[PDB]
Nucleic acid binder design. Structure first.
Lengths: 185, 221, 57, 99, 141
RNA sequence: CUUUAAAUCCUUUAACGAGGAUCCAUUGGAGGGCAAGUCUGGUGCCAGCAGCCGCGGUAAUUCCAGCUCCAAUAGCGUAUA
């Protein structure tokens, strides 16, 4: 007997229809619009929203004025407000079922960098996230699938060790400066 | 390219003295002129083919093939229709099918799943349509679920305006005409089901014919 | 002829031509970007039935 | 039509008796009883009668089963008998179609 | 159901067991005959030795010959008939050369126009047939 | 430098390290099911393809090769319970 974890689970689900036009076009449109890598990421976001919707339907099945329904409904509502895809005016459990997948794709770090104004295009935003140039509250992020919170949207900025945000110049700039000093002396 | 009506309903809609198709559906008046609904429902009434199938008649010399065309009509916020036409060519068949489907359009109401919040989105009860051996059953669904079905009742429920369904079928579903007609019958049977939200006695509103007897005599013989 | 049922006859007698030297194809994220580009945002509102990408009639 | 001969993979055989099931048997002129099979285009386009001349396809993985290629009527038979392609123990016996 | 009594579970259970035995798939999967007469014996792949190469004919509506081999097994030694899939791969198979046979597609059933063959070969001489087709690997010498 | 019994791995970090950024992304398909050529050359019920319907008869939308493309993507195909 060894002391390991042995706990893991899938985060994406394969749809039953492999080849039909409309859902393929809709997923391909979402991949092109938000600049994602492959269909597994949008399937992962759909899987997470499906699990959230299943939990919301399970809470809405149980009758009013119960302790566990109110407790889990307020917990899930507070988490879904604090992740940034809900509003405090819409503070009800029956509005969870009306959410769409684009709302979950809005709070991704790549599109948040693209919409804040730190990159030209959304693909430029993704190759900025993968490049380690920015930070979220004095700590850099490399992963484009970094979901942000409502209080964490304002604090995103360039990292210290980056030529875009002020710091040491990169390899190609130093190589060109060395070439210029070699050609000059 | 003008419209010359043959029934008094066509003229009475033509002179803008019938406001909507709702009282035609209320008084259960038959529709025989296809340009009335084109006068009422305009740019939002879209159509597409479902299946074109050939049938054969055996004669002395060779085989004669006539093409049968199916089509669905209906706007995304209510009414929906269906029509079947067969002809020797494809263009005549699709034009006759489009005309006959536009002529025969049913209304549908929408209900709620548990909580009556916002606009209605689903079928208010369990309805069943049957023709041949084809069975189809419609269940009310929670909001944001989406239509889960075969592709052809998915298309028909998109033209019906309902976006939340749970379906269950039985029989030979490969016959597209009977499956489409059974789903159309299941959609059209949603009014012959007395829920307790309309148990009050209705007030009998005024019939169009007797109200515009004077205009009918003034216009036509 | 030789004989009727010879193994590897057509592929043995098939003319042997090689590949054409070309650049590499874009793989990964930009393949999906170009696919979305060509499929959605470089279209014109035509009429009739749509044409397949391999139509070379 | 044209007088084609045997090549590397073909020999000659003499059909003896009639059998069904799309198969029939013959003695090749090497002296081996072979069981040939009618191959596609000689089934009902052309018929085969008793004791005729048949080009035979061979096998590179066994020697128990043969094939069929063509057929010769009377003048092709005496033409290939003129050069000599069979042992003299076998007899053509003036095979043709009866009048 | 027909028996709708409040204290009836046994008749439902025994009738369901009997009508489950009156089936084909449940009869096949739960008897020793369908696995005892199975050449693979509940195995997906198997090795064997080729002895003869026999070309079997096609069915009625199409006309061809089909290249096949006669394979004896190692674990139980019975004689089966395999089928080399691709075009011109019989030249790689010599007398007494070990192969790797597998299933043919329809779970112990004849597939297509080949009569009486339920197996096909995957690898020969401990190398895949696909690599011999594509010119990737060479047979050992 | 850190880690560790000593390492190694990860991270921190010097000096190096990419224009066709040759530091070169494969696997199964293109008749219907089922997304995607009646393109070109060769064989001619032969070779073979095909889970099913079926495709090949000297003009193959299905075979053998090239180009184009479609599906998933460091993954894809086959056989079995």
């Amino acid at each position: 007997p060894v002391a390991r974890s042995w706990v893991c689970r899938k985060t994406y689900v394969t749809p039953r229809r492999p080849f039909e036009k409309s859902r393929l076009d809709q997923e391909l449109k979402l991949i092109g619009e938000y600049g994602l890598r492959n269909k597994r990421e949008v399937w992962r976001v759909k899987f997470t929203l499906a699990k959230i919707r299943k939990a919301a339907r399970e809470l809405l099945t149980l009758d009013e004025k119960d302790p566990r329904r109110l407790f889990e409904g307020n917990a899930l509502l507070r988490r879904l407000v604090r992740i940034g895809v809900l509003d405090e005016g819409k503070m009800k459990l029956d509005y969870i079922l009306g959410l769409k997948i684009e709302d979950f794709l809005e709070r991704r770090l790549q599109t948040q960098v693209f919409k804040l104004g730190l990159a030209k295009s959304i693909h430029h935003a993704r190759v900025l996230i993968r490049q380690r140039h920015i930070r979220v509250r004095k700590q850099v992020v490399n992963i484009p699938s970094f979901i942000v919170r409502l209080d964490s949207q304002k604090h995103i900025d360039f990292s210290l060790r980056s030529p875009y945000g002020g710091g040491r110049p990169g390899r190609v700039k130093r190589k060109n400066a060395k070439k210029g000093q070699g050609g000059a002396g | 390219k003008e419209w010359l009506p043959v029934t008094k309903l066509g003229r009475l809609v033509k002179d803008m003295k019938i406001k909507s198709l709702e009282e035609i559906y209320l008084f259960s008046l038959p529709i025989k002129e296809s340009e009335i609904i084109d006068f009422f429902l305009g740019a939002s009434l879209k159509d597409e083919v479902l299946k074109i199938m050939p049938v054969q008649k055996q004669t002395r010399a060779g085989q004669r093939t006539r093409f049968k065309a199916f089509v669905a009509i209906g706007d995304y916020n209510g009414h929906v229709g269906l029509g079947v036409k067969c002809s020797k060519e494809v263009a005549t068949a699709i034009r006759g099918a489009i005309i006959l489907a536009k002529l025969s359009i049913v209304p549908v109401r929408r209900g709620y799943w548990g909580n009556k919040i916002g606009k209605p989105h689903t079928v208010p009860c369990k309805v069943t349509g049957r023709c041949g051996s084809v069975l189809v059953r419609l269940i009310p669904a929670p909001r944001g679920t989406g239509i889960v079905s075969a592709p052809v009742p998915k298309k028909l429920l998109m033209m019906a305006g309902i976006d939340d369904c749970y379906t269950s079928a039985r029989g030979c579903t490969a016959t597209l005409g009977n499956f489409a007609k059974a789903t159309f019958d299941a959609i059209s049977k949603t009014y012959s089901y007395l829920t307790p939200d309309l148990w009050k006695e209705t007030v009998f509103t005024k019939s169009p014919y007797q109200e515009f007897t004077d205009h009918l005599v003034k216009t036509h013989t | 002829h030789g004989s009727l049922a010879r193994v590897g006859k057509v592929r043995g007698q098939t003319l042997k031509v090689a590949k054409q030297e070309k650049k590499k194809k874009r793989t990964g994220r930009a393949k999906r970007r170009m696919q979305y580009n060509r499929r959605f945002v470089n279209v014109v509102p035509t009429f009739g039935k749509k044409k397949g990408p391999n139509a070379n009639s | 039509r044209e007088l084609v001969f045997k090549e590397d993979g073909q020999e000659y055989a003499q059909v003896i008796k009639m059998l069904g099931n799309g198969r029939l048997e013959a003695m090749c002129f090497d002296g081996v009883k072979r069981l040939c099979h009618i191959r596609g285009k000689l089934r009902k386009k052309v018929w085969i009668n008793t004791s005729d001349i048949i080009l035979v396809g061979l096998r590179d993985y066994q020697d128990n089963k043969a094939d069929v290629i063509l057929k010769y009527n009377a003048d092709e038979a005496r033409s290939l008998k003129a050069y000599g392609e069979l042992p003299e123990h076998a007899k053509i016996n003036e095979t043709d179609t009866f009048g | 159901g027909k028996c709708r009594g409040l204290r009836t579970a046994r008749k439902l259970r025994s009738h369901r067991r009997d009508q489950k035995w009156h089936d084909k798939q449940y009869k096949k999967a739960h008897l020793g005959t369908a696995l005892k007469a199975n050449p693979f014996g509940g195995a997906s792949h198997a090795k064997g030795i080729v002895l003869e190469k026999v070309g079997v004919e096609a069915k009625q509506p199409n006309s061809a010959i089909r290249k096949c081999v006669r394979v004896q097994l190692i674990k139980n030694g019975k004689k089966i008939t395999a089928f080399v899939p691709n075009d011109g791969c019989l030249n790689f198979i010599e007398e007494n050369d070990e192969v790797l046979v597998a299933g043919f597609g329809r779970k112990g059933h004849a597939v297509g126009d080949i009569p009486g063959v339920r197996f096909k070969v995957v690898k020969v001489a401990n190398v895949s047939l696909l690599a011999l087709y594509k010119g990737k690997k060479e047979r050992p010498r």
